Enzyme design. Structure first.
Site, PDB file in Angstrom:
ATOM      1  N   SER A  23       0.795  -1.219   0.000  1.00 47.86           N
ATOM      2  CA  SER A  23       0.000   0.000   0.000  1.00 47.86           C
ATOM      3  C   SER A  23       0.832   1.274   0.000  1.00 47.86           C
ATOM      4  CB  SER A  23      -0.944   0.027   1.211  1.00 47.86           C
ATOM      5  OG  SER A  23      -1.750   1.192   1.208  1.00 47.86           O
ATOM      6  N   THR A  83      -2.429  -6.212   5.636  1.00 45.34           N
ATOM      7  CA  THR A  83      -2.694  -5.985   4.217  1.00 45.34           C
ATOM      8  C   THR A  83      -1.599  -5.154   3.563  1.00 45.34           C
ATOM      9  OG1 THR A  83      -4.213  -4.331   5.114  1.00 45.34           O
ATOM     10  CG2 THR A  83      -5.182  -6.287   4.097  1.00 45.34           C
ATOM     11  N   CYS A  84      -1.287  -3.998   4.152  1.00 45.39           N
ATOM     12  CA  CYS A  84      -0.517  -2.979   3.450  1.00 45.39           C
ATOM     13  C   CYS A  84       0.926  -3.400   3.204  1.00 45.39           C
ATOM     14  CB  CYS A  84      -0.562  -1.672   4.240  1.00 45.39           C
ATOM     15  SG  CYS A  84      -2.239  -1.098   4.590  1.00 45.39           S
ATOM     16  N   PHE A  85       1.479  -4.266   4.052  1.00 45.20           N
ATOM     17  CA  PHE A  85       2.874  -4.671   3.930  1.00 45.20           C
ATOM     18  C   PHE A  85       3.033  -6.114   3.480  1.00 45.20           C
ATOM     19  CE2 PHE A  85       2.200  -1.767   7.505  1.00 45.20           C
ATOM     20  CZ  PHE A  85       2.813  -0.639   7.002  1.00 45.20           C
TER      21      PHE A  85
END
Ligand SMILES: *[C@H](CNCCCCN1c2ccccc2CCc2ccc(Cl)cc21)CC(=O)OCC
Length: 375
Positions: A326, A348-350
């Site tokens: 992200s 999620t983002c990493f």
């Protein structure tokens, strides 16, 4: 030439918009009867083109929700219904396979089965047209019939390895001394069913001169002959949403990825572009348990695992080395986090999978699979 990504963009640019249509397509459904309610609405519209309008779906009179998200839920719910083998339309290609094929006996219990398949085609075309995925995967001959590609002996391998080996033997050696005839025997309900393969087939010996015809006729009997009307009805509904010359820019593998978000996940390419945090390493025993867990996972659950850690269904082009999070580029990452009693969590983002240090392979298997069953 164009890779899959460039093909998809090229494909969407030709799928031009309809303006002789109402701008919204409204359908109200009840969860308990989502299949009948969807079937009566989609098969009832004036023009199939009405299904190209923006989908405004309402479930059980639940007011004021994002018309984009409920559409995604509908495509999931309707997929689990349409592809339920208990309805008799689709069936598992083999007891050991999870891929689906059209049931040859589809009409036995569904006299109106041909309109059901046209409905399934329209829903499949709607998913492609609206950029949504269907939940279900078919045998490769299914996608090739959609593209009017010939069914080959190689397609038999992905479905039945033992018969593929037998037919490949026939192709590579002179089969005359085996005295094979132009017939097919099928094992159904504890009984042999013989089917000649052409007129007088029982008296025709399979030799080098006619074996290509023999293999072709066996291929057609296995995948095509008994399902031609069902498939034609499905394609009719699909091409009402997607022009059939537009779909032909894709091959069978690209089409499956486009329709169902599915394909082979090279576990190696996944491995080499994976990074570890807080003490984990490639040689760490929990990590080598993780990788052989993923190895023995079916191709669908390998995908569901990636979604759980990434937040998306697709694999990035050129492999896992160009995977994104992200806030920029980020490879797939497994971090030591927590205690054996907890289930893995993913950020999620990493693209990070927080994996507890499990004391056994079988424990890693279960505690990992239970964290993905809720995706
Ligand atoms: C044979 C039984 N035939 C099932 C009837 C068709 C399935 N339906 C359906 C199912 C549940 C509730 C409503 C409906 C409405 C009609 C409809 C329209 C479209 C589609 Cl895709 C399905 C249905 C099964 C059999 O004998 O063998 C079982 C393996």
């Amino acid at each position: 030439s164009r890779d899959y990504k460039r093909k998809y963009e090229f494909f969407r640019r030709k799928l031009k918009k309809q303006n002789d249509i109402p701008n919204k397509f409204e359908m109200k459904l009840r969860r308990a009867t989502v299949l009948e309610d969807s079937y009566r609405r989609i098969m009832g519209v004036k023009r199939a083109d009405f299904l190209k309008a923006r989908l405004w779906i309402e479930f059980d009179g639940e007011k004021g929700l994002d018309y984009g998200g409920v559409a995604r839920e509908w495509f999931f719910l309707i997929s689990k219904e349409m592809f339920n083998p208990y309805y008799g339309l689709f069936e598992y290609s083999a007891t050991d396979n999870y891929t689906l094929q059209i049931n040859p006996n589809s009409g036995l219990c569904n006299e109106d089965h041909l309109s059901y398949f046209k409905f399934i085609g329209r829903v499949a075309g709607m998913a492609v047209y609206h950029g949504k995925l269907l939940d279900g995967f078919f045998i490769r001959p299914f996608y090739k019939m959609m593209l009017h590609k010939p069914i080959t002996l190689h397609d038999m391998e992905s479905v039945d390895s033992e018969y593929y080996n037998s037919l490949r033997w026939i192709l590579e050696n002179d089969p005359t001394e085996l005295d094979l005839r132009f017939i097919i025997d099928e094992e159904l309900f504890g009984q042999t069913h013989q089917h000649e393969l052409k007129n007088g087939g029982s008296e025709i010996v399979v030799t080098n001169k006619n074996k290509k015809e023999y293999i072709y006729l066996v291929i057609q009997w296995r995948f095509v002959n008994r399902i031609q009307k069902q498939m034609a009805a499905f394609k009719e509904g699909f091409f009402e949403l997607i022009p059939q010359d537009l779909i032909k820019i894709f091959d069978e593998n690209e089409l499956e990825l486009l329709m169902c978000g599915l394909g082979d996940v090279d576990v190696n390419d996944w491995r080499e572009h994976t990074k570890y945090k807080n003490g984990y390493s490639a040689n760490h025993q929990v990590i080598q348990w993780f990788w052989k867990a993923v190895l023995m996972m079916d191709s669908e659950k390998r995908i569901r695992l990636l979604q759980f850690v990434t937040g998306t269904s697709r694999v990035p082009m050129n492999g896992f080395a160009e995977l994104y999070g992200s806030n920029g580029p980020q490879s797939f990452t497994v971090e030591q986090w927590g205690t054996p009693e907890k289930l893995p969590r993913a950020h999620t983002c990493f693209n990070r999978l927080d994996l507890p240090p499990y004391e056994s392979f079988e424990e890693l298997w279960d505690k990992l699979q239970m964290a993905i069953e809720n995706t």
